[PDB]
Amino acid sequence: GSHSMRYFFTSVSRPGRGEPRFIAVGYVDDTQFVRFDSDAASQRMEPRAPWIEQEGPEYWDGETRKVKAHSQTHRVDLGTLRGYYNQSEAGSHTVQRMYGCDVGSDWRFLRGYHQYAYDGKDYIALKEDLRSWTAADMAAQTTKHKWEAAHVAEQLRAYLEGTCVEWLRRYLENGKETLQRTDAPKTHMTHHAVSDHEATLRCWALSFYPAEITLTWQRDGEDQTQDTELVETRPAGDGTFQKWVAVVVPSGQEQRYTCHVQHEGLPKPLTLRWE
Amino acid sequence: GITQSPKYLFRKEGQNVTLSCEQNLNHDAMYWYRQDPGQGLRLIYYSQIVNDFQKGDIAEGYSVSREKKESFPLTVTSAQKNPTAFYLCASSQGLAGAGELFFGEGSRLTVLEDLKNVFPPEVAVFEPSEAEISHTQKATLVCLATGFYPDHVELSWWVNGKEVHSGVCTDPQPLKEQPALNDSRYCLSSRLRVSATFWQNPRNHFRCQVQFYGLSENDEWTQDRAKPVTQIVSAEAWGRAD
Amino acid sequence: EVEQNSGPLSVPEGAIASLNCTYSDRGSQSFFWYRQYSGKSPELIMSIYSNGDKEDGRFTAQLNKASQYVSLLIRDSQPSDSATYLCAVGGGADGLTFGKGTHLIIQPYIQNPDPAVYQLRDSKSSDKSVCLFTDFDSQTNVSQSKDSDVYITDKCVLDMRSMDFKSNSAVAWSNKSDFACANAFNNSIIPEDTFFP
């Protein structure tokens, strides 16, 4: 329904063993389309989805350098943060940056964001108003002031509102067969026995897109969410996704309980019971 | 701020020269441009982060280091057959091209083919017409620094010893006295105007000086005259009552 | 790459002055207007990152990423606003390409004009002098000489805060023996109410 262009950057200091690992990737919704790995052969931002190959080297070179500069920021940041936290030259450490836009069904701006983090913890982030800064440490307040004085929020807001959304829409038209398509779930049940008076019920759901989905078990209307087990959404590799939700029951009395599907690939929801 | 030095200079082919440029703003990005007359400013190099720098399209015959984040020194090597230009250092906080670009204060490099043709500015005041001090409540004192090379000059007027601007206009462009070849003489034309109340008073000193950028202390000699060094050259007036 | 409307352009004191610019790279994300006086270092006056207008009192810039249009217009334009205006574009981690430039020259207020032609002999010599055509109005031109050894200068605006006067004062001279000041401007449209003493 709504859509998003998202860019995930990862940066890992490996002291002794040289320059830090740096991996930029780029998603439209849940489809990956650009990548950069510092340990790649190319040293070029590559295409990871056919519909961005259309764009000539003009696009690519400009993206390559842009990403090279992102890495060059983190390169220093690692240096600075080791500074700020008084940590050792011996230790490896991680920065993740993450920015992107969100556009509704009508394809117009709703949310932008710029989350940043050192070693897994939140460090600084651009707040939902695209104007203020939030930051979990006094260390990060030093960065927050730095970023206030510089007026990053200005530059960054005009990207997130502006540059991001017009580029999001350029991609949603290029690969509309890839991206705008909705593949529908393909559900079933694998029922197996744990004991003589007991049995399992997995409500599967394969080959679907996008990864948004909600499967809950209902004992003929009763919201069963204690005995259930719900694994996180696998990517199939395919391009489609997978998911199941398990539950154990007083078995024998099998053909009683309901699996509630929820997806925009399937116009109105579903319910299933044992054959 | 950003400071690039020196405001002017020139070295003969076979020797290098360096334009040192420091900044204390703690900006990551630093850049060097050369501006030619007619053209805009072409990018020579930029430097996104410490220990790193990147080509423009006119880097052939230029070196740059970034050993520290403070300074981006631009070596103009025994470079190309045409380094004579105006050079600009610049820093910017963030990605290269993202922000304000806080510039240095320029540098005026020139070639030197041989130092035999290097002269200083012969200065002369031209006293204000009396038929002009008739119409006005004023007096126009004109100064012609003339017969110098290279183009490297500044110009303040000095009342008793007072660097003065308002009343003065200088002359953004000079004037060459030979309209063809590369080697030639120049001539400037400033214009200090003053009221009739402080001019015509004969006890009041007027002068036009020229901070010439000539030869260094290092340079050579085989002439029958004297050397042109980094100096000041002046010429003066006073009031004549009526 | 960054093509800039170019003249030079004249606009009187108080009149509005506009400058366009256009750029041939969709990857452009940041847009700037720098100003450069002759022999001096470019300084920012306007910067703009998204579409529409940004204003700072007397200057106002506007941008359309779609059309690839970046604009500036100066309100109330002072003489302070003379000399060259620079369109620059960035946002690709590649530095900053500046356009050709546009020399915008503003006409002050020669509000008590009296054109006149005097002579100015030397203080270390007799004769061997110059020609000062002065106080004339801003719409005058001071075009080049007739002889190869006659050297005429172009005009020069000249402000005083004491008297608040502004005088466009040209200069000229020559090495020639039979040189004089009537013939000094025999290649320009000087006003015919000029006061030769």
Partner: peptide
């Protein structure tokens, strides 16, 4: 495509 603005050394 990527940001080329609004990004800074911490």
């Amino acid at each position: 495509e990527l940001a080329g603005i609004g990004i800074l050394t911490v």
